[PDB]
Design a binder for this molecule. Structure first.
Ligand SMILES: *[C@H](O)[C@H](C[C@@H]1CCNC1=O)NC(=O)[C@H](CC(C)C)NC(=O)OC1CCC(C)(C)CC1
Ligand SMILES: *[C@H](O)[C@H](C[C@@H]1CCNC1=O)NC(=O)[C@H](CC(C)C)NC(=O)OC1CCC(C)(C)CC1
Lengths: 302, 299
């Protein structure tokens, strides 16, 4: 309590959303400088989506087959190519609202804001976490493909996700802005299973640090652990093992509280092995795993 | 089913920084007027009992520094409306959206664009609590951040931020400067009335969970409206009105679950708890989705 999922302001990304139509298939695209990025399955008929031959489908296409619109204003396409599972449509106008940006590929556990779009028009913005099985729990309906996920650092938009599909379990899958899927998924209208999901350990630790920052520290014990010993125990409770990068991104919170990362790991290990015992942390018996160390600092320190 | 804020770009283009003395907060720049909390004019030794009319008449236009990014805006006049200051500037904001000022009802939801030094930092969904607080995320310098809804291309501004309470919740005004609730823009520790849970919103969220294939909490029973309300009031839930039942019609139809049947489900949850189980990931009954919110996100 005192914490909520907070998205980044969406305006810089709103200014880049367009619609891309092939035939009657419409989805969203991202217009940066003179290129529009979108999922390559825009070129598919519904009957092609079963087992599309994207390469053969693309050679039958010409620039004049792609309808790109910002609102009702057509953007003329002057070139096209495919990079992994994304289509890059060169257009004759550089987007005057292009922010400073980069394309980043995120790691599981990292959070990002999603600007859910339909027909090139934004509907809503919300925060998502990349699960360890490389799915996200989005709120995506038909026509949402091409909606993007992003973080904003200073003036710079880091695009990290483009939406492509839904799985039998109702979670969602997609690519980075270079078209490489997160996880083992493919853009075919076939049934695909996500791996068993696990709890995001690094984010649980961030949450415990947040509890400590707010004076809730009953769970701190007098012991420590090695990273390997912690990782082996953690996996028995369906928690992700920590990476070295996880240890490093906890550094600022460790410094803020003076609690070594591996000491917090020992406290978490005791919570896993011994349970909560009816106690709460930040007002809950459940450990939250969708706040990153960066999210915690934003809401504790501003 | 996620807590979804409105896209914030139309509001971002209106946020500016307002400084007076050593106080800095945010303003909302629409056409040639900047709206901001009037306590920007207060010093430390003013905040305990500020006679705002007396403090404001002693101010000159040049005492207000307004910055939109790298550009200073020249203040050419000012007036006060309740707890909001209106600074006339010599430049019109070309990014002014179509907009209106509305006062929202308790139980209604809105998006908050949290800003610091006139720079937008985050966006999230809040409800106006029955006790007229909001459970926000606001730090030092967030005052003048606004709350809003969007209908078509029209931004309806309903909230401007002024203060935090010792319990950690928040209070503020509409854009006419009238507080929601019994709060006052003086530097005192203020308590709210007893909060209650927004029952119509809990019911909407239970329907949402069903829509998403989750129905462990349903049961074979029903209840009358009044018997439900007796139990609701016992657990500090708001009463359900017939208008609320009507409003839930579309969700009832979509799911084939009569409103009063869902009320009997909620009654069971209030009396039996959730006993470890969770709904839509939550171990608590969520009451900051309205029926409209649930529908807008299943469409
Ligand atoms: C693109 O807008 C769309 C969004 C999907 C559709 C509904 N919810 C979403 O997130 N993506 C697709 O239609 C996608 C196209 C293929 C070629 C990648 N296919 C898809 O997501 O099919 C899913 C298969 C499993 C079930 C039937 C459970 C849901 C649809
Ligand atoms: C304006 O930016 C600021 C925002 C507050 C500060 C901390 N979190 C917020 O939301 N509002 C004020 O400083 C406000 C000014 C008066 C004149 C209305 N005062 C205020 O909020 O005081 C609170 C009293 C209780 C405690 C100390 C718990 C928090 C500050």
């Amino acid at each position: 309590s005192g914490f909520r999922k907070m998205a980044f302001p969406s305006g810089k990304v709103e200014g880049c959303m367009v619609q891309v139509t092939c035939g009657t298939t419409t989805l969203n695209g991202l217009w940066l400088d003179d290129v529009v990025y979108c999922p390559r399955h825009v070129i598919c008929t519904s009957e092609d989506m079963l087992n599309p031959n994207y390469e053969d489908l693309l050679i039958r296409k010409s620039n004049h087959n792609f309808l790109v619109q910002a609102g009702n204003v057509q953007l003329r396409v002057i070139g096209h190519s495919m990079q992994n599972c994304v289509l890059k449509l060169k257009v004759d106008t550089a987007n005057p609202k292009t922010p400073k940006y980069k394309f980043v590929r995120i790691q599981p556990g990292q959070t990002f804001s999603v600007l859910a779009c339909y027909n090139g028009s934004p509907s809503g913005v919300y925060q998502c976490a990349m699960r360890p099985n490389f799915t996200i729990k989005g709120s995506f309906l038909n026509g949402s493909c091409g909606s993007v996920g992003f973080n904003i650092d200073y003036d710079c938009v880091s695009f990290c996700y483009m939406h492509h599909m839904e799985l039998p379990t109702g979670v969602h899958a997609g690519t980075d802005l270079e078209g490489n899927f997160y996880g083992p998924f493919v853009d075919r209208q076939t049934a695909q299973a996500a791996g068993t999901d696990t709890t995001i350990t690094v984010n649980v630790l961030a949450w415990l640090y947040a509890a400590v920052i707010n004076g809730d520290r009953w769970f701190l014990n007098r012991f420590t652990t090695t990273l390997n010993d912690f990782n082996l125990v953690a996996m028995k409770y369906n928690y992700e093992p920590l990476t070295q990068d996880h240890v490093d991104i906890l550094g600022p919170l460790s410094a803020q509280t003076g609690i070594a990362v591996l000491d917090m790991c020992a406290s978490l290990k005791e919570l896993l092995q011994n349970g909560m015992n009816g106690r709460t942390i930040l007002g809950s018996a459940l450990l939250e795993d969708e706040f990153t160390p960066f999210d915690v600092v934003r809401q504790c320190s501003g």
